[PDB]
Design a protein around this ligand. Sequence first.
Ligand SMILES: Nc1ncnc2c1ncn2[C@@H]1O[C@H](COP(=O)(O)OP(=O)(O)NP(=O)(O)O)[C@@H](O)[C@H]1O
Ligand SMILES: Nc1ncnc2c1ncn2[C@@H]1O[C@H](COP(=O)(O)OP(=O)(O)NP(=O)(O)O)[C@@H](O)[C@H]1O
Ligand SMILES: Oc1cc(O)cc(/C=C/c2ccc(O)c(O)c2)c1
Ligand SMILES: [Mg+2]
Ligand SMILES: [Mg+2]
Lengths: 54, 479, 128, 128, 466, 466, 157
Amino acid sequence: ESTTSEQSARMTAMDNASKNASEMIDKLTLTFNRTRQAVITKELIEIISGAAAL
Amino acid sequence: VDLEETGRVLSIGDGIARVHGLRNVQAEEMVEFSSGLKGMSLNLEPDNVGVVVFGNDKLIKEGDIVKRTGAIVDVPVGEELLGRVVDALGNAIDGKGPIGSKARRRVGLKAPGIIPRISVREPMQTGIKAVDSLVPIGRGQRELIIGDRQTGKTSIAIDTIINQKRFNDGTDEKKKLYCIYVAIGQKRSTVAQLVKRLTDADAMKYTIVVSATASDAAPLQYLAPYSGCSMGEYFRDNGKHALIIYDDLSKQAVAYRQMSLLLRRPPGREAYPGDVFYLHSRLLERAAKMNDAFGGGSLTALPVIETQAGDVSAYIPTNVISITDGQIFLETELFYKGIRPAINVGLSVSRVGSAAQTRAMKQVAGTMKLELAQYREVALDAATQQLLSRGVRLTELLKQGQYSPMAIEEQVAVIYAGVRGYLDKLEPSKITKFENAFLSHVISQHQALLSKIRTDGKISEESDAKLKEIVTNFLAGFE
Amino acid sequence: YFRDNGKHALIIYDDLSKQAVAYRQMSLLLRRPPGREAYPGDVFYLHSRLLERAAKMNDAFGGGSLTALPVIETQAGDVSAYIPTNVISITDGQIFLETELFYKGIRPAINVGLSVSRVGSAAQTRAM
Amino acid sequence: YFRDNGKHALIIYDDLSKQAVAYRQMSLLLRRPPGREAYPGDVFYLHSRLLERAAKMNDAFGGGSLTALPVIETQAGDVSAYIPTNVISITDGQIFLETELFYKGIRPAINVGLSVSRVGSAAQTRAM
Amino acid sequence: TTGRIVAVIGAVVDVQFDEGLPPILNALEVQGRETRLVLEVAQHLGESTVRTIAMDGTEGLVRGQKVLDSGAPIRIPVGPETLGRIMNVIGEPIDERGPIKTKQFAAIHAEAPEFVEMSVEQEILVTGIKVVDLLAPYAKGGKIGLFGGAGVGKTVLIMELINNVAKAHGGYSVFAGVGERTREGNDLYHEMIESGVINLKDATSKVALVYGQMNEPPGARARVALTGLTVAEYFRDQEGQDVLLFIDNIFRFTQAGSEVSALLGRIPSAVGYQPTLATDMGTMQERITTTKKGSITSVQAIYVPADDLTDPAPATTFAHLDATTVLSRAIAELGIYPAVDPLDSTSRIMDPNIVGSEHYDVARGVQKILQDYKSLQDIIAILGMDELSEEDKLTVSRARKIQRFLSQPFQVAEVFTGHLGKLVPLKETIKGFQQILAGEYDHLPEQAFYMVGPIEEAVAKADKLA
Amino acid sequence: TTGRIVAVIGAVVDVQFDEGLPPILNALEVQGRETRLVLEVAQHLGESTVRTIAMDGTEGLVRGQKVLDSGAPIRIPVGPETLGRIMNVIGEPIDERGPIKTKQFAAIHAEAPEFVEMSVEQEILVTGIKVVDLLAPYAKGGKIGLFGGAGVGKTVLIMELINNVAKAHGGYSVFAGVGERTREGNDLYHEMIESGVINLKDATSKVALVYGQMNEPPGARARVALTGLTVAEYFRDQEGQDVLLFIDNIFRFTQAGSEVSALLGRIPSAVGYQPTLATDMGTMQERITTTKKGSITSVQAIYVPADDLTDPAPATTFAHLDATTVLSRAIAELGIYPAVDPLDSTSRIMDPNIVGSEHYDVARGVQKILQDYKSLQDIIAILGMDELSEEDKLTVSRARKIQRFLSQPFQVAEVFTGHLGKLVPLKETIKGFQQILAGEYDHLPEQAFYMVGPIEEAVAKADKLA
Amino acid sequence: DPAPATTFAHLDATTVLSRAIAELGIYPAVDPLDSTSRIMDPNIVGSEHYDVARGVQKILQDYKSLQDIIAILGMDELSEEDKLTVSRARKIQRFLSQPFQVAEVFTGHLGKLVPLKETIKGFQQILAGEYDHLPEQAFYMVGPIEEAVAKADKLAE
Ligand SMILES: Nc1ncnc2c1ncn2[C@@H]1O[C@H](COP(=O)(O)OP(=O)(O)NP(=O)(O)O)[C@@H](O)[C@H]1O
Ligand SMILES: Nc1ncnc2c1ncn2[C@@H]1O[C@H](COP(=O)(O)OP(=O)(O)NP(=O)(O)O)[C@@H](O)[C@H]1O
Ligand SMILES: Oc1cc(O)cc(/C=C/c2ccc(O)c(O)c2)c1
Ligand SMILES: [Mg+2]
Ligand SMILES: [Mg+2]
């Protein structure tokens, strides 16, 4: 009765761990690109301001 | 010869015409190019005028003659614009001949100050159950419609427009609502389809459509909302009620960024100019409710904002939330799962609408808000399973198709069923079915009561007890 | 010279990051407009006109060829950086190498899942 | 003054972040083209020459000294940012404080791994 | 003498004078207008030309148009008859109740109180809000700052504070609506009439209103704070009295600043902002202060663009405050109101010798368990509750009960919450968190702590849950 | 009339004209060159000088070299004589078959059809390809994003689309190679010759090719789309057809415009894209649409930079798409041709109010059964196929049987395989899957539905299997 | 960063130091998965030197990709040959540390110079498994392999 409940629960826990992780992958993926876009834009505005000041 | 009323084009190509002369022009005054294009004096410099071009500057050459028009940028205004499709300047684009317009109003007029206003108080009935009950709107309020592409945003605006027919065919003049749909950045075919849709619903006869589409020049796209807004103000300041839709402001800010970067305005967050907030703020400030001493008129503004990947925290989304009086937020995930209209209730607010919600809706709505508040918290003991039982079912009640907006009394009878537990015994995949069978039954058999609820604006103790009969009688016979 | 006179040459450009940098220098000092990463608007053109000159000629023209193995250095494996974006887009495939594979004892450090050749089977003998 | 007259002094600069903000202001209105993070290209030098003047003189010059404690504010715990690293790269060590340590109860919120002294046990009594 | 416009661009107008060049900061009156259009001299461009900033719309202006030097900067009414009135940036009445007839006038530009004029006294100001009074309490005569992103609760919190602090305070108040909503002005004005803190027929008015909302052009928003502020200075100095000053929203001053800086032809600084961001704000903030001559308790709403507290506007604001209350979208979205971040709000009177060791110990304890819990949240987000040791589970359960008990129903927010508003005495706040830290309520379910006042209500809600 | 080159800086050339100036967008012919050098007027600098963007290399140009204003924008040959031809951006043949002899020429810059010239109706453009029509159907005059990249049936699908639209709707096709790789343009041209869609012997050709190769200047690659677009506008406008327009690829149209923008000295916008990103896109896209006379439908290949759907380029693009065809490598490796993913591929017109109540319900059932088949494949791996419920046994059979019926043989590949291709009428598509879902073919073997036309040929394939 | 990035190519050997590694007290804080030499080649330093080195990087890199993984998924789930490469890499990391003569003021330790062969031999031995019984901290901040063994006894009491 013990191992039936164990592998049952482990199955469930790991199912949830995997799904949580998957949800976390997306959220970080969104952040990355929001950061990725800002860095690029930031680097560019620094260059423009530098050329325009001449 | 005359450089006081006239100038010649020095340079052109950055969407900005440098113009020698024009010594007597005003700031923000419309000018008129030799090719028929309109323009706006923006930069009054010692030796030139910077003129923003209200169309395709391919048509402007060096040496072209520009004339003053004497007028600060304004647009045609009045009732003759109803049933018409116009471009951002007001010139008709539906090819139904000239607008027979009698007054004109400036596109940049400062919003009404503090004194002439009073807090919103008359319902602006969308006809969408989820909105009118959970995110209710009053006339004069600004409510943002916000979400990723393809989440049902325009739908909210359209059914709202279509809903007003019920009043616009009455003789109750204060109960009426004239609509203006401002298309900034959309596909022209999308707009054309839309007025066809409106025409089909006989709604176009009380709508003004202002169009500044994907292929109109940027300055036009930027102007359209203000042009739209003055047309609205006509009704606001005249004891009448207008609703305006800025569809959508994301695209308009894009229009404005293009103008500012070409004008060499220092780029800030996401290359947007310092004044990107002010661009929207001044506009939406112009939606207002006027007290009885200034007519009692009102302009309601439903602006549209397009999020990237449900990110409400980005520059432009937050600017506009920082302007309007709450938001309907539309989730891609909800839309995907077919939950429609895809309203995230938790993240949606109306900062001022509770005051302008009918008592009749409020009596079923307050408890629905509450039971849905409990259900989100727990998405096998007695109590907490029942809030699941109730929750899924209220969620099915908020579903609704398009182009069938609902009279307020019809909405409450439906929600009554829900909030009085009558739906608990049935299965989730049958609530939609029960709703339509039940709604059409009461429309055909129990008109007296639905009218009485509309007329009393309330559910009376008789009405309630009478509506207790109708539901029990129907549910026992629903198969 | 080989391509046109019936023969086959292999060209290794080592590397193009550094080439672009030299051009970026000249452009900026010539006061041409800086773009992403301060590269000018003709940096893709620079590399695309080089790499198009690699080609398989028909028999009518001698039947020779010039094959190009351009080299691009990434920074922290950013294949989405301006110049890498340009050469990846331009080429017919990429051999991607990684530092983690390297120290895993996988040498040469070719990422086999990511590397590609759109020419593919077309340039293998039936044996392989 | 103390330093060169056989006396010892201690100077706190609270803070040099805000000084940098003020020099960036002054520099841009003098029409000097902005550099990394809008600051001028010599923001390092701004702090380098100030802090090199904290010094220990030998007996022939008086035996006096001046000890500095520049203060730098970070943004969201990032000791590794451009400006922070500039200053770390001037001084003889740093004491890095963190909010997480602070509220965990570790006050003074000194992060041991990331802090250092470049003088080490030479600045301690034999006892310590 | 008399000057002619030679350039216009949005808020920025250049004016050439043949003799008599007006000093920087002088207000200039543009002739040929139906309503008064003030220009403020900003810079001396040279060649007998000055660059100025407009306090209103510049549509209609022509090159050649005439301008008069007023001889001074913008002067505005100050004194007892500003009370009950609404004025604009240039002191004009905007309530349609006629002339404002004061004896005194003041310039909106003054230098900041000198170093010798500072007060050193720190006395706690109890707000009745649990989160604030516990973790980062306000101080009488101090500088309070309310940080928050779009829609997270800045204005509710300030209105709540006006209810909870102003009413029971025998002094005068100034509310400066800066770049915010006009209909909120309309709300605030009638609410005060309804409560009689503004009386339309008495002399008993206690608040003065200054407004330049988001319908105004940038110059107006760029200066309204100075107006509002100036009115507050009079009451502090020319009476010695206890003045309250609420600004919503001060960020709007820097943003406004940002909008004219492009036009004024400055080289921009970080994120597009004006390279004078810091000093602009400093010259203005340093005026918002308690002096030896009289106390000002200032509560300023501070908007965070794009939820980025590293943005120059808010980042530069932090160092001007004696207490911060940083609101958090994420927290508001979890239902905790006020959406106070308990580990980002600070106060300079959070010191055992000012608030007493008991208060200090509980607060540090509350913030300790909240940080330990915050450290555990990544292990939670992958593997969840179960994988934690028995100990961690306890820090979790207690922290979560503590987060909920930090929330409070506001009298001003009863429509959104569905609860009658609550105001908790300082003692009761301490004893409540104390008791949750000693483990006295470990047996109670979280939900009991959400949206209550004193600890006793949580208990009652627990029993009510059966 | 004739002007003189005054400045050559890379692919930007400035010309001075003594008399009448060539308006923006006009095409300039540079003299004294072995091959054609077209300069597109981009700006009017003042002082009688235009700024131009070169359509070819500028090596060799001398200051003073004569430039003839053609009096119009770039005009290219259009009409039936273009079919089977490859032209470049300025309308010259590059297939070395001699002049394209048409009775019309047309300018590549045209404004979009007016509001009145728009069809208010939404029609399906039947492709004959089962997967598409049923699940992600094309709007007549809509835009479709094509995802996949290499080795996924991308060329075969294109070639079959050309063929099916010529047959069923009597419209031709245009292919615009924006940043076409010379090598791949050689391959595609021959692949088209071999499949029949181009025919070099007679005049039965169905595509016209316009190539903007990668080694051409920024301005060339930015304009090729327009060139091809105008070739397509002839067929819609002069002949009343429903035309197919392929753009390969739409990302390189953006980038090319970004590079043009950068050369003209303009300030980059977010992520270094041109500030006119949206308008550049808008003025090209809006031309793709249904008029009262005919329609142009466009199949556009998309590259998503950084795999970021929120990158300005794909963001801006998506605003114009009405449907996506997604070609997946996974599906190809399962032998499904076309390699179309039935779950990933969407359409805006997948709406009962447009395609009909019936067409809606079948698609949503096919979508549902495939989604539910994905739910079980884990339990298939865990408990085997014989531990499913009897209703669940069916969903699998049916799902697997639907999966294969979505595959289909193409005419364009009759040469390579020996199997006759199928253009399947919309109603037979609707019916086939309609009847499968109902279980009217559960008794039939799984392999009967694979690589088949209409549902009759599945029963025919089942009866032939001994 | 443009500056350091442009420098690598002017170099025949690169010693890259890391803050993450210094933070752990590992000095010199050399990153063994990012430091290189032109002469790190068997035809030059011999097959014995090369194989050892490559091994050290192998176990270290293998460890690095197990780190973030077992940090949340628990140590106990590992194969008994995997959790040996965990124990061995963690020792080799420490054995990479070394007290410097010029850093006596920073360490408290005496400076130690390790001859080439002794370094090769010491690491060869750790990879072999000859010290799986020795405690981690025994290899920390010592010179040659002997002193790790000696340090092991001083830690035994
Ligand atoms: N209440 C509804 N029930 C069912 N379908 C709906 C509903 N509302 C919208 N739709 C469908 O969903 C699609 C998208 O709705 P739409 O109103 O275009 O949202 P949107 O976000 O404004 N679109 P876009 O502006 O192009 O991003 C349309 O094709 C509608 O047919
Ligand atoms: N203490 C609170 N209790 C309950 N709800 C609240 C509270 N504070 C804010 N809200 C909700 O959030 C909404 C916005 O509040 P508000 O005070 O306008 O925030 P804000 O930060 O001033 N918005 P903005 O100025 O646009 O950034 C209110 O209408 C409420 O629905
Ligand atoms: O969220 C965002 C989005 C974005 O597009 C840009 C920024 C910041 C840009 C920046 C640009 C130049 C600077 O000098 C600087 O300090 C900052 C932040
Ligand atoms: Mg829409
Ligand atoms: Mg607010």
